[PDB]
Amino acid sequence: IDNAVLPEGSLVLVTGANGFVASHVVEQLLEHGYKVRGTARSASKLANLQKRWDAKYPGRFETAVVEDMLKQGAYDEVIKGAAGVAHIASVVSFSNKYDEVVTPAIGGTLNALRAAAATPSVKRFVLTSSTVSALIPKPNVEGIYLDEKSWNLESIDKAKTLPESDPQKSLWVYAASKTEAELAAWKFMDENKPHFTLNAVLPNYTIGTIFDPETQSGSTSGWMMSLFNGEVSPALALFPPTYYVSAVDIGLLHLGCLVLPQIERRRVYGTAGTFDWNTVLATFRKLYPSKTFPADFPDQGQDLSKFDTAPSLEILKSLGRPGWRSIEESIKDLVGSETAIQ
Amino acid sequence: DNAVLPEGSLVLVTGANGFVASHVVEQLLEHGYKVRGTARSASKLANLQKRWDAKYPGRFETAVVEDMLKQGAYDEVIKGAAGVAHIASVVSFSNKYDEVVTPAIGGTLNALRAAAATPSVKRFVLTSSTVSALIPKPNVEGIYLDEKSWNLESIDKAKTLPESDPQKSLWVYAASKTEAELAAWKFMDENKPHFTLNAVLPNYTIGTIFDPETQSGSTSGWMMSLFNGEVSPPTYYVSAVDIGLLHLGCLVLPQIERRRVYGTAGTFDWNTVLATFRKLYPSKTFPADFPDQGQDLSKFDTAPSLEILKSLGRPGWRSIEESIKDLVGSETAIQ
């Protein structure tokens, strides 16, 4: 990558590297000649992915264990030698209680940022936020344009007082946690003025290959894979139409945020195009004509929102892509195509 | 395609001046049908007659029916009609159960008798309500409404509730709608007439008010009063255009016979409405959010409704923001 701010062969720390989106960030870093150190709560969580990257990119990926993401000093050992950091602000919804979900998301982000501020070698930091830090997808709402100034401020209070019976409450709690974490990151940058530059990537609904299905199935692509296999969730039919984005493209967006000189203090939207479950089902049926699939879902309406994707397309162009990968190609990355083996 | 009423046929719409009825009329006229619309006086239809004379020239005609109950009331106006849409409206000039419920049944039975004596009438659609199935109550699990659900409870409740009960008028309205729809289905079974009956059961209808001077005593009229800052259970909304489409499908679609068709698009409360008002009119000031009304946990069997909408060219229910926009518009800075 010409004029890269992180030299070729530099080491990037990717937190939560076992996660589905994170594993695509790692893969695109490795694909472009960078070394990666990936953290997980236990070595077992990375063993399969470690096996894949040792085969695919020998000697370029290393597992690092961070048992407590919140503990002070948690990243102080693993960050040493890193020229960049990719922190994925993951949300653990083991509970309905706002404080149990939102606070660890902020706390993990601040901990990673503190570690970077104490490491002079770190030059770039990329935070994985979400489009929910701008808005919750709402079908058939006109006049929604999201840009780098759009913030989901409402989600913070809304997530606190929604009825438990509301089918969308978990989505709102996830939105509050992503919003609060991204806000905390930008506030950290302004208050502490650290030596590194921060960028945020805001993926929407990421569709792509699941490298290790046994552990990565609790992901956007994992849910789509369960649908492919004939599973239907009641929350599935109440999910709003939204934007998809290819998992490779999301990995590229993080790579550009880490290495490209023209990308500083940006919020980069991962929003390729709109979709609903019936477009997914139609693509399943074309890719596997012999397979039986669930029936079409009742109409969920249409997403009329639009996103300012100018820095995203700039990054994609700088990294050699004509534009967004198509949903049909993205879905094919996930489920493959029907083959008659002879 | 395959409409059971020929294209260009005449439909009699009773009470055509009413808000819901006027949307039934508009959707019939929009689809190339002729409409004869009745009202208690010509004055109640003059404004609507002017609008439909402009929008659909020569396709709407006013007919005066002073007494909806009197025998023979529809004998002239029904002649030549291939369909009848009777809106079972409820006149709440009184709290007395007998004074409210009895005319609702009597008008329905009179319309049905007129259709039974007119061979040209092939389809009859009755405007009932979701209150003929249930009265909305917040935070009740396991409520599923289907075409067998009947609000039998409302009949006794409406007669003996205390006057101080804030819900008493709603229960009397529920009893009138239930008793009228029951009477219609019982008429079909006892008299076995030549035409087919369908019922549309709207919930809270939201849409454009064609004639504000006369149509404001409606669900949409109440919302417009809130929009204008007046404050005078959570339930399902439905777009007024969708309700008109549901009546049209009940009148012309071959796949729809002896059905109770729910107009129930999605749940809402007044604070959802106020939020939509504030977004549509950022400069305008509106009433404060209401105290928590609870949540509507009921679900409706909307299978024939969605079949009708699909057959008439729609992807599904019209959205609440689109429906509220139909009613109040959006803020404009005129240059």
CATH number at residue A300: 3.40.50.720
* Residue closest to A209 by CA, chosen among A246, A254, A256: A246
The pairing of strands A84-88 and A11-14 is parallel
Strands (E), chain B: 10-13, 34-39, 60-64, 81-87, 123-127, 144-145, 196-202, 204-206, 235-239, 260-263, 266-268, 299-300
Judging by beta carbons within 10 Å of its beta carbon (0-12, 13-18, 19+), is residue A173 exposed, middle or buried? buried
- DSSP per-residue letters across B134-179: ----SS--S-EE-TT---THHHHHHHHS-TT-TTHHHHHHHHHHHH
Instruction: Flag whether A57 is marked binding.
Output: no
* Chain B CB contacts of A165 below 8 Å: 139, 295, 297
Q: Min CA distance, B23 vs chain A (Å)?
A: 22
Instruction: Examine residue B288 and state whether it is found in any structural domain, yes or no.
Output: no
Using only the alpha carbons of chain A, give its radius of gyration. 19
Instruction: Examine residue B157 and state whether it is found in any structural domain, yes or no.
Output: yes
* Contact at CB, A163 and B297, closer than 8 angstroms: no
Q: Cα A113 from chain centroid? A: 18
Domain count across chain B: 1
Alpha-carbon separation of residue B303 from A298, B198, B265, B310, B323 (angstroms)? 10, 14, 12, 11, 21
Instruction: Examine residue B216 and state whether it is found in any structural domain, yes or no.
Output: no
Query: What is the interface size between A and B, counted as CB pairs within 8 Å?
Result: 19
Q: Min CA distance, B264 vs chain A (Å)?
A: 14
The pairing of strands A197-203 and A267-270 is parallel
Q: Are B219 and B205 in contact (CB under 8 A)?
A: yes
Count of H-run helices and E-run strands, chain A: 10, 12
* Contact at CB, A141 and B297, closer than 8 angstroms: no
* Chain B CB contacts of A142 below 8 Å: 321
Determine which of B298, B319, B331 to mutate to test the interface with A (most A C-beta atoms within 10 Å).
B319
Residue of A nearest to B141 (CA): A165
Q: How was this structure determined?
A: X-ray
Angle at B303 between CA B301 and CA B304, to 5 degrees: 115
* Chain A CB contacts of B295 below 8 Å: 163, 165-166
d(CA A179, CA B172): 49
Domain around B260: 10-207+237-265+301-325
Instruction: Examine residue B294 and state whether it is found in any structural domain, yes or no.
Output: no
Report helix angle A247-259 to A327-335, nearest 10: 110
d(CA A28, CA A251): 6
* Contact at CB, A165 and B297, closer than 8 angstroms: yes
Instruction: Examine residue A126 and state whether it is found in any structural domain, yes or no.
Output: yes
**3-class SS of residue A302:** coil
d(CA B246, CA B239): 11
Instruction: Examine residue B162 and state whether it is found in any structural domain, yes or no.
Output: yes
Instruction: Examine residue B231 and state whether it is found in any structural domain, yes or no.
Output: no
Q: Min CA distance, A74 vs chain B (Å)?
A: 44
d(CA A236, CA A224): 10
Instruction: Examine residue B41 and state whether it is found in any structural domain, yes or no.
Output: yes
Provide the phi-psi class of B279: left if phi over 0, else alpha when psi is between -120 and 50, else beta.
alpha
Q: Min CA distance, A259 vs chain B (Å)?
A: 40
Query: What six digits make up the tokens of A27?
Result: 């893969």
Query: Which of B295, B297, B321 is closest, CB to CB, to A141?
Result: B321
Q: Cα B190 from chain centroid? A: 26
* Contact at CB, A298 and B316, closer than 8 angstroms: yes
Cα torsion angle, A207, A213, A215, A217, sign: positive
Breaks following residues of chain A (C-to-N distance > 2.5 Å): none
